[PDB]
């Protein structure tokens, strides 16, 4: 009972300190920057071959190779330039919710409702793709696998916790706890030393991969957070929730900078991605179309559209040349 | 596709696509059903021809040249709103209710109410199974059907009591284009597969009728 009072006063101290740092909103300082106009993006490629809903997609580090997981139980690696299928990996469980690509192109980790993160080796001497390691230890559905190196991966689950794994040994090196709801997404910072995870408790909190410490927590959303992605400089991140609102939080100021809500938007955000410059905030919505937000003025700088069903995944190449979108209509479209 | 190496890469892609289409053909002869219900309600012992295969449990019994795949979602112990949309394309929903449990009956009704009126399952027909007729028949004589349902007013006979429970479950439908196929089952019933088969065939006709434009 006494500690409960201590908990409350600590929140008041944080809120007062957080409010005292606020001097001017982001939309008030950059009011003199000229708008970026209309970003009209045209479909350049249409990747077909999936026979079920597409739930995840990750870009290769060379901005040419893609990976996509679907309910059909197939894992396809695409040549994004010539639309050729490089690999086709049959999964054990057809219920895959996330699917990641290694930064070196050697491995692919891709898992889901089976509570297991399966890692596949592409550069094998036998010419086929084999299941190198199956990571187990999560009691809930898996989401947002992210490779750190060729032998280190961070995973998120519905156990209200995320885990840091060692692919060689197979043991859970570090476990990050503190969420009070299913964790739906995570993103790795460019300096590969920090990451943020968005959970169902309407809170995203910054975690340290080396120490396993919740350095900071961020609030403001009214519903569960569905997606997250860092600003390109690794000093801010953007979240997407079922509240049909996008928000930009700053790690140094510990306060949200601006909101990306529009009166015509009803359905929540599914995916969040940034451009190479950090100016266009692309977000996928449940009303079958993606919107491009000017991340500095909260102005809709065009709409992608085109898809027939809910857009479930977004992806921007490392060089920023193209944007890949996946939806439940079993089609991947590449925009530019 | 100009270079010699790129010509073989295109040949590899076309060979991959052939197997992708072939696997899709073999994935159209199976019926995907969803198992739901409270614990200890017989949701794992409906058909004695199991041929099963913590998390998701599959069951792939076959009947009359048709493949039935049953997905048991129990044991996840997570928020259903985040992964129940994966089963948006299931043919039907199989719900199991235990008539001898007077305490979990209200818990079962909450489960049925949430699932039936879910936004993803607004058109998926439900095959509702009422289990353990004999256990319920003996239980009602010892304790009347009034502690669980204080609003009951009809005769204390088995026929009226069992039908009264059925009416409550169908009172939660509240939607068109959805039909609830009920059936009373016991422990020593072998024709559960036959009951599922005729309901699934009946559900397919309704969806085909809407697609053809007749209705």
């Amino acid at each position: 009972d006494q500690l409960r009072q201590e908990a409350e006063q600590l929140k008041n101290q944080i809120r007062d300190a957080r409010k005292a740092c606020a001097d001017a909103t982001l939309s008030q300082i950059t009011n003199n920057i000229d708008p970026v106009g209309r970003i009209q993006m045209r479909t350049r490629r249409t990747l077909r071959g999936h026979l079920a809903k597409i739930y995840a997609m990750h870009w290769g580090t060379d901005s040419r190779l893609l990976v996509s997981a679907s309910q059909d139980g197939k894992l396809i690696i695409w040549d994004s330039y010539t639309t050729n299928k490089v690999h086709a990996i049959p999964l054990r469980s057809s219920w895959v919710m996330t699917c990641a690509y290694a930064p070196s192109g050697n491995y692919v980790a891709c898992g889901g409702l089976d509570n297991i993160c399966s890692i596949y080796n592409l550069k094998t001497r036998e010419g086929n793709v084999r299941v190198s390691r199956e990571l187990a230890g999560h009691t809930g559905y898996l989401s947002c696998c992210r490779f750190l190196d060729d032998n280190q991966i961070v995973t998120s689950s519905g156990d209200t916790t995320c885990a840091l794994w060692d692919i060689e040994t197979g043991q859970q090196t570090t476990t990050f706890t503190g969420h009070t709801g299913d964790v739906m997404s995570l993103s790795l910072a460019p300096d590969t030393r920090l990451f943020v995870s968005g959970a169902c408790d309407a809170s995203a909190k910054l975690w340290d991969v080396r120490e396993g410490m919740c350095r900071q927590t961020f609030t403001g959303h009214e519903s569960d957070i569905n997606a997250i992605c860092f600003f390109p400089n690794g000093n801010a991140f953007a979240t997407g929730s079922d509240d049909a609102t996008c928000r930009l939080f700053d790690l140094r100021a510990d306060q949200e900078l601006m909101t990306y809500s529009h009166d015509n938007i009803i359905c929540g955000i599914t995916s969040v991605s940034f451009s190479k410059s950090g100016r266009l905030l692309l977000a996928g919505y449940d009303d079958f179309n993606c919107n491009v937000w000017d991340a500095l003025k909260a102005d809709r700088a065009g709409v992608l559209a085109g898809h027939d069903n809910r857009v479930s995944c977004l992806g921007v190449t490392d060089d920023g040349m193209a944007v890949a979108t996946g939806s439940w209509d079993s089609f991947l479209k590449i925009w530019n | 596709t100009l270079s010699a190496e790129e010509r073989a890469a295109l040949e590899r892609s076309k060979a991959i696509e052939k197997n992708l289409k072939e696997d899709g053909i073999s994935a159209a002869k199976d019926v995907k059903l969803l198992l739901l219900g409270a614990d200890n309600s017989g949701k794992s012992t409906i058909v004695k021809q199991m041929k099963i295969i913590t998390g998701i449990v599959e069951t792939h019994f076959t009947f009359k040249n048709l493949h039935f795949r049953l997905f048991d979602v129990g044991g996840q112990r997570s928020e259903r709103k985040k992964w129940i949309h994966c089963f948006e394309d299931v043919t039907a929903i199989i719900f199991c209710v235990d008539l001898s449990d007077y305490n979990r009956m209200h818990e079962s009704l909450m489960l049925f109410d949430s699932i039936c009126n879910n936004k993803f399952f607004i058109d998926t027909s439900i095959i509702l199974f009422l289990n353990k007729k004999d256990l319920f028949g003996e239980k009602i004589k010892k304790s009347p059907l009034t502690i669980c349902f204080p609003e009951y007013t009809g005769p204390n006979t088995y026929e009226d009591a069992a039908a009264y429970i059925q009416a409550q479950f169908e009172s939660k439908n509240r939607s068109p284009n959805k039909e609830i196929y009920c059936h009373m089952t016991c422990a020593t019933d072998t024709n559960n597969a036959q009951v599922i088969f005729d309901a699934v065939t009946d559900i397919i006709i309704a969806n085909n009728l809407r697609g053809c434009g007749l209705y």
Partner: single-chain antibody
Amino acid sequence: DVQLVESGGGLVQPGGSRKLSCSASGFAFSSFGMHWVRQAPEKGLEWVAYISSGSGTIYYADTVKGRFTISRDDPKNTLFLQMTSLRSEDTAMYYCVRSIYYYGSSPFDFWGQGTTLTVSSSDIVMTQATSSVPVTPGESVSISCRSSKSLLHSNGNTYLYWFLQRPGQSPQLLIYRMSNLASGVPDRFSGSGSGTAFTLTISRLEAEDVGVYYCMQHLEYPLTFGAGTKLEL
């Protein structure tokens, strides 16, 4: 362990027919394209025929076009080469090579052990400057060969392959496009080039690097090898 073994060699009379079998054990044979390469006595390597994965696309060399035939038995993991009429030119050590083609693949990594066949009594021309180069260990060696056309495709890839045939062994792939090191080769090897002139450099040469070096083009069929540069110590 990847292993290709060939059998069916021997002494045959002119005008007869022989069949060579290449049984594979250690890799997914059904996904690889298999070539036949023959090496005449102390003359050099020469491409013969190629069958694609799934027996879709088949090619033959102009020398033995319409005379040889290639067949593929995927369930048995065996590759055949039936020769109808044999002259005195057919005598050579026939090798069996696997090849897989996709974005970023290595289509000439593994060569078979080779079988010896003895018989009793337009195209891209690649030329190697020299035939014998004496050198001592620790000294960098540069090997260069030219070509008729420009192997640099419009896609940005240059199709040049460098092989090393140690004495008494089978050729081993070192560089497969212009500078892409093969799997398991030492990092001291490096390659470069510009369109029609290419160079292979070996820094900090070791005693086991001696042998005959061949440069081959894969821009267009038929495949043509170089004259062959021999390193002496």
